Amino acid sequence: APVKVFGPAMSTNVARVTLCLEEVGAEYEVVNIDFNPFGQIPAFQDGDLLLWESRAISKYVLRKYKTDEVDLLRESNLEEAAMVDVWTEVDAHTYNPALSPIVYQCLFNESLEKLKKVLEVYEARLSKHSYLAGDFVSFADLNHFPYTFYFMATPHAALFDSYPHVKAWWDRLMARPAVKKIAATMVPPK
């Protein structure tokens, strides 16, 4: 029975969730709604269950449809899950925040030094591991996709070229069937 996502497709918070759904091979429809006790978007129906908060929706999607093949949270492995969480929280508290000003400015219209300084660190991390959480893809890696997608529409895309391990890491992420499927979806309704 298909699970349902409500919100705009191109929305960073929706794409986080459509991505997780694609990654685990779930069946799902996306409904765009107009104008759940804060009245929040995205929302997500799994039959009787209603969820809001795209982190909780995603971690739910990744738990419901976990296989040995597709295990992107890694809760079975203590140190692994810790690193998934650490870099999830770095995406949320440091990375995403550096990109937003530049996406807002530089698509609908300072923070570039913070990101250079953040990229030095991601570059170090990614020189010692395939992926952020260690030598395996995880939610941490997937979390970076929405905000970074839009960053590469801007004329500051080329900055990743001073951070080769970050370029290669990103390219690798762009290469994934799921990631591509969603990237297509991130458009206004015409």
Add this chain to the structure above:
Amino acid sequence: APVKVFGPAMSTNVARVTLCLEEVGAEYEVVNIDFNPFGQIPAFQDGDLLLWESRAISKYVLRKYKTDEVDLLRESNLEEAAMVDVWTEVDAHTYNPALSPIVYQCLFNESLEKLKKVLEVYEARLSKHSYLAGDFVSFADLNHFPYTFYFMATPHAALFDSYPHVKAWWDRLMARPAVKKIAATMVPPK
């Protein structure tokens, strides 16, 4: 072998972690440091493992020392863990943000209408369940402690009295041995 927490005791981000440690009965020292690749506080050493980001540190503490008796994340139970995450994310994105202005203003020196509106919802939630994540305490409940602790030092403490289920829920939280032990610790060094 004791795990180690670095940071100021009275810090909201440190207390989140000392609380989780107390709740699970772990052995731990707290070191206050001066002036981990963003150089972040709090930090946490488990022998060879170093963690930063207090959400990841806490979720780690709660996983390492999970018992059948003390299971505050509930990853074994799909819907349960979803609700733990949902209300964790509500504390982070809505609740905590309503309190900070009032703690900053009204201890070192508008947002009161947002919180009234947030409290209406918590009151509803808490009228239908013992605790936020359903009829069992969890990380979600514990997450609220630091920022709310300081809110009740202010002259707006009495506002919880218009939200009885939220008053009773809070009182219940204040009653816990762990919660009290930490509350004692949340003082400057004299």
